[PDB]
Amino acid sequence: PVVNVADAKGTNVNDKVTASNFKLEKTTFDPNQSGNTFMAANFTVTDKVKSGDYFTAKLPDSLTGNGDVDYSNSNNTMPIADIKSTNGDVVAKATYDILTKTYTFVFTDYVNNKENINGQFSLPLFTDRAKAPKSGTYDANINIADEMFNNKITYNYSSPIAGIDKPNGANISSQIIGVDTASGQNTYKQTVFVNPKQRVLGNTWVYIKGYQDKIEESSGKVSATDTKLRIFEVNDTSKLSESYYADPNDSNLKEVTDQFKNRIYYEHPNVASIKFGDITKTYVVLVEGHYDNTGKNLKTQVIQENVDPVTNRDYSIFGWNNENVVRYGGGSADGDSAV
Amino acid sequence: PVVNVADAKGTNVNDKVTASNFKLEKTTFDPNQSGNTFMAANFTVTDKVKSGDYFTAKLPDSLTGNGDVDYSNSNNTMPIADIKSTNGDVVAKATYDILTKTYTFVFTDYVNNKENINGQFSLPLFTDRAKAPKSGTYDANINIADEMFNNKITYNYSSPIAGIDKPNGANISSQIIGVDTASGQNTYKQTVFVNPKQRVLGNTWVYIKGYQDKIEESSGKVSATDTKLRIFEVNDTSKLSESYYADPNDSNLKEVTDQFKNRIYYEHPNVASIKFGDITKTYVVLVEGHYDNTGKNLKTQVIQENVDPVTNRDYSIFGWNNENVVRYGGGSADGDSAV
Ligand SMILES: [Mg+2]
Ligand SMILES: [Mg+2]
Ligand SMILES: [Mg+2]
Ligand SMILES: [Mg+2]
């Protein structure tokens, strides 16, 4: 069904581009607390190039260019600030391919009959919650125009394992690891860890709220129509990530969603209630919800409540907050050509 | 020397654009603690327009589109995310004029033979530290395509008047109210309030550091060549702004910079030392410095130290931190046309 694709286009000119003066803002941070970094580099075009010629930058397993901003509803492509000339003309158009973690800078006409083309650029960088699942240090070697710039980044993820300091106190945690702020659909992906302490909890209930204290302060929309939940039993809690990334097809997870057919209730506005009952294992709840158009930050709160299995007393409750900005500067407009 | 200018261009088409569904993220915040807001609106083109036609948005006295990001070294013009089509083509180019607090959206060719052009856009909004000097509520009425959208914003500026809780304890405050992250010059504007408590301080010294604890953690560059200081005596401290905006030509300020010819020392790396001596009035120090290219956040720390005028004892010292991000995604490149 056709032939080669290797982005042939106006041909790759990484062989005519030299990156230098590579800098990283910081090499240690906590992605669970808005922690992220930045990169900057200089680049000079060593030979004559044309409009349509392009050079690239590739990210290693440990990094992503989009972070918690989901672009799956945008062809899995992330728009990037272009490199501009003093006049303001675009010297090159920038785009980030989520799948190949590759940045593509395509030169415009400005490059036609020009020499000594020299400049610089900086880009935001984040953790790859899926490939850097645990806290620790990773190689973060970056490739710019077929040149390597070695780095080492340390991720100190705030631990997902948290709760009341009591032998069998309530304990739950969460993190919104995906927010679509560009497509217009306004979706978000959130991972919830119920009982990551692996304690024995009686008559436990979990609440996933689309707000924290004031419903009007959050854009979150949690309802039977706006929210989709999938529940999994964790076999080995220590194999559970600290970045909250959780693949529904993970072998360490046993999906028990069906068993919860009638254990999920939408009793109160913007609140999904889950009846877990007596449990001893850790559970993962994969949330796929939406937020409104008020532009308010997406604020969520997960609560876990329970009593002692044996005495049905010794009540305990624990809560965890989440908050992601939904802001997406710019605008969108579309019209139809006249008949 | 010529004629009219009123941005004639491809003519103003505000008369063919209707804004609606106006929303403000929040109406109350603290600009001294990263407090700012956002606006969003829908817009439809009511008549046929061409490439080059443009509509505008005007901000009231209480707001600015740039905030603490200085654009004076960029023709006092602020680049703004364009309005894109599904295809990704630019429906309109956006630009913000700092001077006239006006946003100009210029339609491209995409608009030529099109109808039902409909869309939306959102923009960051900040306080006008100069026109909303004091904490309180102001009218924040915004004009979009010759249509008004009334608002009321309340600014709770963290008070500049702070220091040791002692009849004559050290007391100082500051705020970086201007950072140039686009031109390449890397300048910053910081206002310092020395003794805003109007206490009587003996043998007082003030230190303006371009870092906080670790010199390597900040991009700040404070030195005889990188820093320029102007010192003013405050006549009525209550007339002093809470947003830290301080015009050197303000009537409430008496410049005593010359008198400090030999009272300013650069003894320690990244630290400017000022010998005030015995003082009772409040002083304003206008700082014009630079930061390096490490991309590190601009972190500063101002310290005030003193003893009791009468006993030359009862030592006191107070410090104040500042921190602004220097990050400016994107890139710059320039070449020369070949001979
Ligand atoms: Mg190369
Ligand atoms: Mg257990
Ligand atoms: Mg109009
Ligand atoms: Mg006094």
XYZ file of C-alpha atoms and ligand atoms in Angstrom:
682
model
C 0.000 0.000 0.000
C 2.571 2.647 -1.111
C 6.229 3.376 -0.148
C 8.788 5.075 2.142
C 7.933 8.028 4.388
C 11.026 8.968 6.444
C 9.854 12.624 6.435
C 11.665 13.008 3.070
C 10.192 16.508 2.527
C 12.655 19.311 1.708
C 15.315 16.925 3.023
C 16.845 16.796 6.489
C 19.702 19.269 6.946
C 20.913 18.261 10.410
C 24.230 17.806 8.593
C 24.384 21.558 8.029
C 23.396 22.583 11.551
C 25.620 22.691 14.611
C 24.122 23.127 18.057
C 26.240 24.532 20.853
C 26.168 26.287 24.202
C 23.651 23.732 25.535
C 22.121 24.651 28.884
C 19.607 23.090 31.270
C 17.755 25.239 33.785
C 17.874 22.540 36.462
C 18.514 18.788 36.690
C 16.559 17.866 39.813
C 12.858 18.370 40.465
C 9.478 16.950 41.501
C 7.023 16.382 38.601
C 4.227 15.786 41.145
C 4.563 19.363 42.380
C 4.698 21.325 39.118
C 8.354 20.360 38.776
C 9.808 20.689 35.277
C 12.808 22.136 33.457
C 13.977 24.070 30.378
C 16.683 23.745 27.734
C 18.496 26.319 25.623
C 21.022 26.105 22.838
C 22.750 28.084 20.118
C 22.821 26.951 16.507
C 24.553 28.019 13.313
C 23.825 26.905 9.746
C 27.150 25.720 8.284
C 26.084 25.466 4.638
C 23.548 26.943 2.243
C 19.981 25.813 2.915
C 16.579 26.498 1.349
C 12.977 27.085 2.387
C 11.611 23.687 3.333
C 14.892 22.352 4.699
C 14.617 21.241 8.318
C 16.691 20.115 11.285
C 15.566 18.192 14.360
C 16.013 17.544 18.068
C 15.244 14.199 19.710
C 14.395 13.623 23.367
C 15.517 10.561 25.360
C 13.229 8.129 27.195
C 13.284 10.265 30.340
C 11.797 13.427 28.861
C 8.799 14.745 26.945
C 8.137 18.096 25.354
C 4.481 18.252 26.344
C 4.412 17.059 29.942
C 0.910 16.909 31.392
C -0.674 18.680 28.424
C -2.423 16.044 26.347
C -2.297 16.427 22.560
C -3.927 13.119 21.593
C -6.965 15.074 20.377
C -4.683 17.195 18.158
C -3.078 14.564 15.901
C -0.650 13.914 18.740
C 1.272 16.987 17.577
C 2.279 19.886 19.808
C 2.549 23.458 18.441
C 5.778 25.249 19.307
C 6.935 28.866 19.276
C 8.765 29.594 16.044
C 12.258 31.028 15.691
C 11.875 34.657 14.653
C 14.130 37.203 12.963
C 14.663 40.770 14.187
C 12.080 41.874 11.623
C 9.809 39.329 13.245
C 9.657 37.105 10.187
C 9.665 33.378 10.840
C 13.087 31.851 10.208
C 11.679 28.417 11.021
C 8.387 26.793 12.052
C 8.569 24.512 15.118
C 6.525 21.381 15.840
C 6.849 18.566 18.382
C 5.811 15.002 17.562
C 4.603 13.409 20.803
C 5.071 9.881 19.407
C 8.684 10.290 18.288
C 9.577 12.924 20.908
C 11.054 14.870 18.019
C 11.123 18.609 17.372
C 11.120 19.657 13.742
C 12.257 23.141 12.759
C 11.361 23.933 9.136
C 13.176 26.884 7.531
C 11.105 29.373 5.546
C 11.900 31.608 2.548
C 13.873 33.904 4.840
C 16.647 31.332 4.420
C 16.749 31.335 0.594
C 19.733 33.551 -0.269
C 21.189 34.064 3.196
C 24.456 33.129 4.882
C 25.824 33.129 8.427
C 22.338 32.189 9.622
C 22.971 32.070 13.355
C 20.673 31.997 16.377
C 19.314 30.177 19.419
C 16.228 28.603 20.957
C 14.847 27.327 24.249
C 12.211 24.704 24.984
C 10.227 23.505 28.003
C 11.068 19.955 29.116
C 9.184 17.554 31.377
C 9.341 14.044 32.753
C 8.031 11.069 30.816
C 5.751 9.770 33.562
C 5.659 6.388 31.789
C 9.365 5.778 31.125
C 10.646 7.375 34.332
C 7.994 5.704 36.599
C 10.060 5.712 39.778
C 11.896 8.410 41.670
C 15.594 8.359 40.889
C 18.213 9.495 38.395
C 18.072 8.888 34.648
C 20.153 9.635 31.584
C 18.680 12.630 29.792
C 20.861 12.776 26.711
C 19.450 15.093 24.069
C 20.145 15.002 20.339
C 20.177 18.282 18.402
C 21.108 18.178 14.696
C 22.800 14.763 15.042
C 24.862 15.890 18.014
C 24.566 14.580 21.569
C 24.409 16.703 24.695
C 24.557 14.411 27.719
C 22.615 15.098 30.879
C 21.441 13.439 34.067
C 18.117 14.315 35.643
C 16.921 13.279 39.067
C 13.203 12.946 39.716
C 12.060 13.243 43.325
C 8.380 12.432 42.799
C 6.325 13.341 45.844
C 5.362 9.855 47.014
C 1.905 8.571 45.954
C 1.839 6.429 49.094
C 0.250 8.730 51.660
C -2.507 8.730 54.265
C -3.409 8.850 57.957
C -0.625 7.784 60.307
C -2.598 4.931 61.845
C -2.163 1.142 61.382
C -5.321 1.124 59.275
C -6.123 4.742 58.612
C -7.679 6.015 55.413
C -5.123 6.551 52.654
C -5.509 7.725 49.069
C -3.602 9.741 46.461
C -3.975 11.185 42.967
C -2.536 13.194 40.115
C -3.920 14.684 36.913
C -1.416 13.494 34.326
C -3.151 14.667 31.180
C -5.114 17.793 30.305
C -6.292 18.658 26.790
C -6.247 22.434 26.547
C -6.009 22.793 22.776
C -8.525 20.614 20.908
C -11.584 22.170 22.531
C -12.905 18.911 23.956
C -11.609 19.771 27.433
C -10.676 16.274 28.618
C -8.385 15.289 31.441
C -6.723 12.082 32.585
C -6.274 11.450 36.290
C -4.803 8.462 38.105
C -6.042 7.653 41.592
C -4.347 5.260 44.002
C -6.810 3.922 46.555
C -5.200 2.423 49.653
C -1.605 2.526 48.367
C -0.639 1.668 51.954
C -2.118 -1.813 51.448
C -3.973 -1.531 54.747
C -7.080 -3.557 55.637
C -10.034 -1.195 55.392
C -13.641 -1.872 56.291
C -16.687 -0.459 54.513
C -14.521 1.913 52.525
C -15.848 4.603 50.226
C -13.978 6.781 47.750
C -15.150 10.132 46.396
C -13.798 11.754 43.269
C -14.783 15.425 43.319
C -14.434 17.846 40.422
C -13.746 20.663 42.869
C -12.176 21.154 46.274
C -14.205 23.448 48.550
C -16.167 25.726 46.264
C -17.741 24.137 43.202
C -17.565 27.523 41.437
C -13.779 27.723 41.878
C -13.110 24.737 39.620
C -13.862 23.926 35.983
C -14.094 20.225 36.750
C -17.178 18.370 35.540
C -17.770 14.996 37.148
C -20.996 13.207 36.286
C -22.380 10.031 34.754
C -22.073 11.616 31.298
C -18.810 13.512 31.783
C -16.819 10.864 33.625
C -15.540 7.416 32.710
C -13.956 5.183 35.352
C -11.985 1.941 35.101
C -10.910 0.175 38.300
C -7.921 -2.119 38.763
C -6.577 -4.375 41.486
C -2.851 -3.908 42.106
C -0.928 -7.177 42.472
C 2.420 -5.750 43.609
C 2.088 -2.229 45.045
C 5.851 -1.654 44.973
C 5.741 -2.088 41.186
C 3.268 0.791 41.098
C 4.728 3.975 39.590
C 5.431 7.139 41.584
C 4.617 9.366 38.617
C 1.056 8.026 38.629
C 1.379 6.694 35.107
C -0.763 3.564 34.967
C -1.381 1.607 31.795
C -4.732 -0.235 31.952
C -3.030 -3.141 30.178
C -0.251 -3.368 32.785
C 0.323 -6.963 33.939
C 0.560 -5.747 37.536
C -3.063 -4.614 37.230
C -6.214 -6.740 37.203
C -9.235 -4.870 35.885
C -12.289 -5.200 38.123
C -14.311 -2.439 36.461
C -17.248 -4.695 35.589
C -17.500 -5.859 39.198
C -18.129 -2.214 40.049
C -21.102 -1.885 37.706
C -23.366 -1.049 40.635
C -20.792 0.252 43.102
C -20.388 3.617 41.405
C -22.850 6.367 42.288
C -23.443 9.950 41.258
C -25.269 11.118 44.364
C -23.939 14.616 44.845
C -23.201 17.306 42.248
C -19.718 17.040 40.795
C -18.974 13.962 42.896
C -18.558 10.326 41.890
C -18.939 7.918 44.816
C -17.344 4.480 44.832
C -18.258 1.714 47.248
C -15.175 -0.469 47.683
C -16.286 -2.205 50.876
C -13.783 -4.361 52.740
C -10.433 -4.264 50.965
C -6.796 -5.077 51.652
C -5.158 -4.556 48.236
C -4.248 -1.291 46.534
C -6.484 -0.129 43.695
C -5.996 2.133 40.715
C -8.874 4.186 39.370
C -8.342 5.540 35.874
C -10.409 8.678 35.413
C -11.377 10.195 32.062
C -13.380 13.331 32.663
C -14.002 16.836 31.405
C -13.870 20.407 32.649
C -16.069 23.334 31.637
C -15.325 26.582 29.769
C -15.183 29.008 32.688
C -11.424 28.921 32.252
C -11.151 28.218 35.973
C -8.313 25.981 37.092
C -9.148 22.283 37.148
C -9.324 21.520 40.853
C -10.079 18.025 42.119
C -10.219 16.310 45.494
C -10.214 12.578 46.196
C -11.476 11.334 49.552
C -11.259 7.895 51.129
C -13.279 6.939 54.169
C -13.511 3.784 56.252
C -13.898 2.002 59.589
C -12.180 -0.986 61.163
C -13.099 -4.306 59.479
C -13.227 -6.148 62.808
C -14.929 -3.629 65.121
C -16.674 -1.539 62.460
C -15.463 1.405 64.551
C -12.331 3.576 64.619
C -13.481 5.834 61.787
C -10.876 7.388 59.469
C -10.937 9.762 56.464
C -8.188 11.129 54.234
C -8.196 13.577 51.323
C -5.902 14.576 48.467
C -5.989 17.672 46.238
C -5.054 18.181 42.607
C -4.933 21.359 40.517
C -3.896 22.021 36.921
C -4.108 25.246 34.966
C -6.395 25.065 31.925
C -5.201 28.348 30.400
C -4.231 28.161 26.747
C -3.337 31.569 25.360
C -4.194 32.242 21.747
C -7.373 31.626 19.812
C -9.228 29.530 17.266
C -11.384 30.611 14.324
C -12.956 28.835 11.362
C -15.122 29.898 8.460
C -16.545 28.456 5.258
C -15.607 29.487 1.741
C -18.479 31.255 -0.037
C -20.375 29.482 -2.803
C 6.206 66.804 8.664
C 3.601 64.524 6.973
C -0.035 63.560 7.805
C -2.543 61.321 9.643
C -1.642 57.892 11.032
C -4.687 56.445 12.852
C -3.527 52.918 11.874
C -5.421 53.406 8.569
C -3.973 50.169 7.108
C -6.465 47.664 5.656
C -9.085 49.622 7.605
C -10.529 48.850 11.025
C -13.381 46.333 10.899
C -14.504 46.413 14.535
C -17.863 47.309 12.979
C -18.043 43.828 11.472
C -16.972 41.935 14.586
C -19.120 41.036 17.569
C -17.539 39.733 20.750
C -19.593 37.649 23.141
C -19.445 35.092 25.923
C -16.888 37.226 27.806
C -15.280 35.482 30.768
C -12.703 36.384 33.412
C -10.797 33.666 35.244
C -10.841 35.585 38.527
C -11.463 39.151 39.728
C -9.429 39.245 42.934
C -5.715 38.602 43.343
C -2.305 39.718 44.627
C 0.079 41.021 41.911
C 2.938 40.951 44.454
C 2.621 37.176 44.735
C 2.401 36.119 41.082
C -1.260 37.128 41.089
C -2.801 37.705 37.661
C -5.848 36.765 35.603
C -7.099 35.685 32.161
C -9.868 36.671 29.756
C -11.740 34.720 27.099
C -14.334 35.635 24.526
C -16.133 34.417 21.431
C -16.290 36.440 18.236
C -18.103 36.225 14.919
C -17.458 38.221 11.741
C -20.814 39.732 10.715
C -19.838 40.918 7.232
C -17.366 40.115 4.477
C -13.780 41.046 5.329
C -10.420 40.798 3.557
C -6.795 39.975 4.320
C -5.395 43.020 6.075
C -8.638 43.947 7.818
C -8.270 44.091 11.593
C -10.268 44.410 14.800
C -9.062 45.480 18.238
C -9.415 45.151 21.997
C -8.596 47.963 24.425
C -7.655 47.582 28.086
C -8.718 50.025 30.826
C -6.378 51.910 33.168
C -6.363 49.037 35.658
C -4.922 46.367 33.379
C -1.977 45.595 31.116
C -1.365 42.768 28.700
C 2.314 42.375 29.527
C 2.475 42.603 33.308
C 6.011 42.386 34.662
C 7.517 41.443 31.300
C 9.223 44.530 29.929
C 9.003 45.134 26.175
C 10.619 48.584 26.052
C 13.620 47.017 24.300
C 11.278 45.532 21.667
C 9.627 48.649 20.203
C 7.271 48.540 23.172
C 5.312 45.863 21.305
C 4.349 42.485 22.740
C 4.035 39.384 20.506
C 0.822 37.420 20.961
C -0.346 33.929 20.029
C -2.257 34.051 16.765
C -5.763 32.745 16.140
C -5.417 29.507 14.195
C -7.721 27.473 11.963
C -8.235 23.710 12.240
C -5.719 23.311 9.416
C -3.401 25.360 11.582
C -3.317 28.297 9.196
C -3.297 31.730 10.786
C -6.729 33.357 10.653
C -5.290 36.471 12.287
C -1.969 37.785 13.620
C -2.068 39.201 17.173
C 0.003 42.047 18.625
C -0.249 44.112 21.813
C 0.779 47.771 21.913
C 2.071 48.480 25.424
C 1.580 52.246 24.994
C -2.059 52.127 23.897
C -2.897 48.906 25.771
C -4.451 47.763 22.516
C -4.547 44.317 20.931
C -4.636 44.238 17.155
C -5.808 41.121 15.337
C -5.004 41.290 11.611
C -6.868 38.846 9.346
C -4.853 36.957 6.738
C -5.729 35.566 3.286
C -7.653 32.752 4.958
C -10.428 35.337 5.281
C -10.623 36.317 1.587
C -13.635 34.388 0.257
C -15.007 32.997 3.508
C -18.229 33.456 5.457
C -19.510 32.539 8.916
C -15.992 33.151 10.226
C -16.533 32.304 13.878
C -14.161 31.605 16.760
C -12.722 32.585 20.133
C -9.595 33.720 21.949
C -8.129 34.111 25.423
C -5.468 36.465 26.743
C -3.406 36.854 29.920
C -4.209 39.995 31.929
C -2.262 41.740 34.685
C -2.374 44.777 36.921
C -1.103 48.155 35.782
C 1.248 48.711 38.713
C 1.308 52.436 37.868
C -2.411 53.184 37.475
C -3.619 50.811 40.193
C -0.906 51.851 42.748
C -2.894 51.019 45.867
C -4.692 47.919 47.047
C -8.408 48.158 46.395
C -11.090 47.694 43.758
C -11.039 49.244 40.291
C -13.197 49.304 37.190
C -11.778 46.875 34.653
C -14.035 47.520 31.692
C -12.696 45.965 28.509
C -13.482 47.010 24.946
C -13.573 44.339 22.232
C -14.593 45.389 18.702
C -16.265 48.595 19.956
C -18.258 46.735 22.587
C -17.870 47.088 26.351
C -17.643 44.233 28.822
C -17.710 45.669 32.335
C -15.693 44.198 35.165
C -14.436 44.985 38.642
C -11.078 43.744 39.857
C -9.795 43.867 43.403
C -6.061 44.034 44.024
C -4.831 42.823 47.406
C -1.162 43.753 47.016
C 0.964 42.098 49.673
C 1.966 45.170 51.677
C 5.401 46.694 50.899
C 5.550 47.956 54.481
C 7.195 45.078 56.329
C 10.014 44.416 58.778
C 11.007 43.354 62.292
C 8.284 43.770 64.904
C 10.303 46.138 67.076
C 9.870 49.917 67.614
C 12.974 50.486 65.506
C 13.749 47.164 63.915
C 15.221 46.761 60.458
C 12.597 46.945 57.719
C 12.891 46.734 53.944
C 10.915 45.451 50.952
C 11.198 44.955 47.197
C 9.682 43.742 43.960
C 10.982 43.132 40.449
C 8.420 44.938 38.318
C 10.073 44.620 34.934
C 12.004 41.830 33.236
C 13.093 41.903 29.589
C 13.030 38.316 28.385
C 12.699 38.938 24.656
C 15.175 41.533 23.350
C 18.268 39.622 24.442
C 19.634 42.408 26.625
C 18.421 40.679 29.794
C 17.528 43.750 31.862
C 15.310 43.969 34.899
C 13.687 46.768 36.869
C 13.331 46.424 40.622
C 11.915 48.839 43.179
C 13.241 48.728 46.726
C 11.613 50.415 49.711
C 14.143 51.059 52.461
C 12.614 51.706 55.880
C 8.988 51.926 54.699
C 8.113 51.830 58.408
C 9.591 55.328 58.779
C 11.524 54.213 61.848
C 14.660 55.952 63.152
C 17.599 53.741 62.236
C 21.229 54.176 63.189
C 24.226 53.278 61.034
C 22.004 51.490 58.556
C 23.266 49.486 55.611
C 21.328 48.013 52.705
C 22.456 45.127 50.506
C 21.023 44.359 47.101
C 21.997 40.802 46.181
C 21.569 39.207 42.769
C 20.932 35.853 44.424
C 19.445 34.497 47.625
C 21.522 31.702 49.184
C 23.420 30.094 46.342
C 24.924 32.422 43.755
C 24.694 29.604 41.182
C 20.919 29.286 41.650
C 20.204 32.749 40.253
C 20.870 34.471 36.930
C 21.132 37.851 38.617
C 24.191 39.965 37.850
C 24.833 42.813 40.256
C 28.043 44.775 39.805
C 29.399 48.242 39.108
C 29.003 47.599 35.370
C 25.746 45.631 35.430
C 23.809 47.710 37.939
C 22.520 51.273 37.974
C 21.008 52.746 41.140
C 19.041 55.937 41.779
C 18.051 56.818 45.351
C 15.082 58.906 46.461
C 13.812 60.381 49.705
C 10.101 59.758 50.275
C 8.198 62.817 51.517
C 4.875 61.134 52.330
C 5.230 57.363 52.803
C 1.465 56.814 52.678
C 1.483 58.209 49.128
C 3.944 55.457 48.242
C 2.437 52.763 46.002
C 1.773 49.190 47.132
C 2.507 47.804 43.673
C 6.072 49.108 43.942
C 5.667 51.300 40.890
C 7.815 54.367 41.508
C 8.361 57.076 38.931
C 11.720 58.826 39.475
C 9.985 62.086 38.550
C 7.272 61.626 41.195
C 6.737 64.801 43.249
C 6.585 62.700 46.417
C 10.195 61.695 45.741
C 13.351 63.766 46.184
C 16.334 62.308 44.356
C 19.442 62.062 46.528
C 21.415 59.828 44.164
C 24.337 62.241 43.829
C 24.680 62.439 47.609
C 25.318 58.699 47.478
C 28.232 58.993 45.057
C 30.565 57.440 47.615
C 28.047 55.540 49.727
C 27.591 52.722 47.232
C 30.065 49.846 47.318
C 30.622 46.650 45.386
C 32.520 44.728 48.041
C 31.191 41.221 47.638
C 30.380 39.287 44.456
C 26.863 39.906 43.206
C 26.182 42.338 46.046
C 25.752 46.109 46.020
C 26.212 47.685 49.456
C 24.630 50.998 50.396
C 25.611 53.052 53.418
C 22.547 55.039 54.476
C 23.742 55.899 57.980
C 21.292 57.495 60.397
C 17.899 57.847 58.738
C 14.283 58.444 59.701
C 12.560 58.814 56.307
C 11.598 56.094 53.846
C 13.760 55.709 50.749
C 13.191 54.288 47.300
C 16.030 52.660 45.402
C 15.408 52.249 41.690
C 17.452 49.342 40.387
C 18.333 48.741 36.735
C 20.340 45.562 36.460
C 20.920 42.501 34.328
C 20.806 38.729 34.614
C 22.971 36.168 32.830
C 22.171 33.508 30.208
C 22.093 30.412 32.407
C 18.324 30.596 32.101
C 18.145 30.318 35.883
C 15.342 32.182 37.609
C 16.191 35.744 38.593
C 16.460 35.529 42.365
C 17.256 38.583 44.468
C 17.485 39.373 48.166
C 17.509 42.798 49.805
C 18.857 43.141 53.335
C 18.690 46.058 55.749
C 20.787 46.206 58.882
C 21.080 48.720 61.701
C 21.554 49.584 65.373
C 19.885 52.062 67.704
C 20.773 55.706 66.909
C 20.989 56.630 70.596
C 22.739 53.607 72.141
C 24.411 52.277 68.989
C 23.242 48.890 70.281
C 20.106 46.765 69.866
C 21.179 45.315 66.521
C 18.513 44.401 63.946
C 18.492 42.880 60.430
C 15.685 42.124 57.992
C 15.614 40.508 54.550
C 13.248 40.270 51.590
C 13.270 37.852 48.638
C 12.245 38.291 45.023
C 12.062 35.757 42.189
C 10.936 36.038 38.570
C 11.089 33.426 35.847
C 13.301 34.391 32.899
C 12.060 31.607 30.611
C 11.001 32.724 27.154
C 10.063 29.784 24.959
C 10.829 30.066 21.275
C 13.961 31.170 19.486
C 15.760 33.856 17.521
C 17.839 33.576 14.347
C 19.344 36.058 11.905
C 21.435 35.785 8.774
C 22.784 38.006 6.017
C 21.757 37.912 2.378
C 24.579 36.670 0.135
C 26.412 39.100 -2.128
Mg 24.843 18.602 12.720
Mg -3.498 -5.274 52.586
Mg -18.377 45.476 16.775
Mg 11.009 58.384 60.735
